Amino acid sequence: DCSPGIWQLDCTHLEGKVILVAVHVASGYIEAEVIPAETGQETAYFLLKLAGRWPVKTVHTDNGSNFTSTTVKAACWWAGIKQEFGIPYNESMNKELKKIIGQVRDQAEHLKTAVQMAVFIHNKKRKGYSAGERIVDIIATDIQ
Amino acid sequence: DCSPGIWQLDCTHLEGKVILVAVHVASGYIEAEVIPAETGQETAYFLLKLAGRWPVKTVHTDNGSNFTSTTVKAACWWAGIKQEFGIPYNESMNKELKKIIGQVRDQAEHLKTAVQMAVFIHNKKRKGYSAGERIVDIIATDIQ
Ligand SMILES: O=C(O)Cc1c(-c2ccccc2)c2cc(Cl)ccc2[nH]c1=O
Ligand SMILES: O=C(O)Cc1c(-c2ccccc2)c2cc(Cl)ccc2[nH]c1=O
Ligand SMILES: [Ca+2]
Ligand SMILES: [Ca+2]
Ligand SMILES: [Cl-]
Ligand SMILES: [Cl-]
């Protein structure tokens, strides 16, 4: 998709741990972190954090049951976030992010550190704007 | 100050808990969260997260000893962050953010939720651009 308010939110597993990945669809910009466990509390918290930082209008996921908890629904309600239905189920940021995580894995002891390093590398890499430059360009243009 | 790479990073205390607050100096845009405890590990982790999301060149703090830990220094080294020395010690986002936190405190059980709600309110409030609009404007203009 390409609307500037659309985000994709999924969890991946690595080293018996859970990584929450949010992708700004229009830009490829990512935010991610290791979460203690795959729960509605964690997801709702991540969403509130995301919505305070970017203009999040709609969120899609590849696992719809991710968004059934009362806590998630309350976070989306409070922040004014809707579920995206204009993206069908049939990218692979998860493999690409895991590729980068594997590249920097030894640069840190804890996976959570490695994940942030990978996010940094992903968002700054030019290919020629970076995802980080693209998101601010897309959002700033959408204001004016 | 007004350079687009300058951030201010402090901790506040509330309800026997610790809130890490990062302020984009040029825009007034904030990121914050409740951290388990006031440690170098927590600060370094916050900094890596921040640097992967925004172009962080320099960081100032009101408590210089915040940045003495080996872990913090390594995070700044890795991300290419320098300590800001162009801002002297003699804003009050901490009182203003605590004001908003107190306004929404009952809207959530856990302080960490309240804090994100306050960040959201702060960043979206027009006064007439919002801090959230100002930061993307400042950063996007600084690319082109
Ligand atoms: O390895 C981790 O997961 C973070 C970490 C780092 C570190 C911080 C930034 C980049 C890479 C590693 C660290 C670094 C030093 Cl010089 C000493 C203790 C340290 N202790 C830690 O826990
Ligand atoms: O109160 C918290 O700190 C978060 C939270 C919320 C909540 C989520 C977003 C905004 C406000 C509160 C919640 C909401 C419902 Cl409808 C049910 C269980 C819930 N349980 C929780 O832990
Ligand atoms: Ca319930
Ligand atoms: Ca040491
Ligand atoms: Cl280490
Ligand atoms: Cl509650």
TrEMBL record, chains A, B:
What do the Gene Ontology cellular component annotations say?
host cell; host cell cytoplasm; host cell nucleus; host cell plasma membrane; viral nucleocapsid
Tagged with keyword Glycoprotein: no
One function term, GO molecular function aspect: endonuclease activity
Q: Which cofactors are named for this entry?
A: Mg(2+)
Can the keyword NAD be found in this entry's annotation?
no
Q: How does it sit in the membrane?
A: Lipid-anchor
What broad class describes the main subcellular location of this protein? Answer: host cell
One GO term of the biological process aspect: DNA recombination
**Any idea which UniProt keywords this protein has?**
Aspartyl protease, Capsid protein, DNA integration, DNA recombination, DNA-binding, DNA-directed DNA polymerase, Endonuclease, Eukaryotic host gene expression shutoff by virus, Eukaryotic host translation shutoff by virus, Host cell membrane, Host cytoplasm, Host gene expression shutoff by virus, Host membrane, Host nucleus, Host-virus interaction, Hydrolase, Lipid-binding, Lipoprotein, Magnesium, Membrane, Metal-binding, Multifunctional enzyme, Myristate, Nuclease, Nucleotidyltransferase, Phosphoprotein, Protease, Repeat, RNA-binding, RNA-directed DNA polymerase, Transferase, Viral genome integration, Viral nucleoprotein, Viral penetration into host nucleus, Viral release from host cell, Virion, Virion maturation, Virus entry into host cell, Zinc, Zinc-finger
Cellular localization per UniProt:
Host cell membrane; Host cytoplasm; Host nucleus; Virion
Q: Which residues form the Integrase catalytic domain?
A: 1-139
Q: For this protein, what reaction is catalysed?
A: 3'-end directed exonucleolytic cleavage of viral RNA-DNA hybrid; Endohydrolysis of RNA in RNA/DNA hybrids. Three different cleavage modes: 1. sequence-specific internal cleavage of RNA. Human immunodeficiency virus type 1 and Moloney murine leukemia virus enzymes prefer to cleave the RNA strand one nucleotide away from the RNA-DNA junction. 2. RNA 5'-end directed cleavage 13-19 nucleotides from the RNA end. 3. DNA 3'-end directed cleavage 15-20 nucleotides away from the primer terminus
Top-rank lineage group of the source organism = Viruses
* Protein name in the entry: Gag-Pol polyprotein
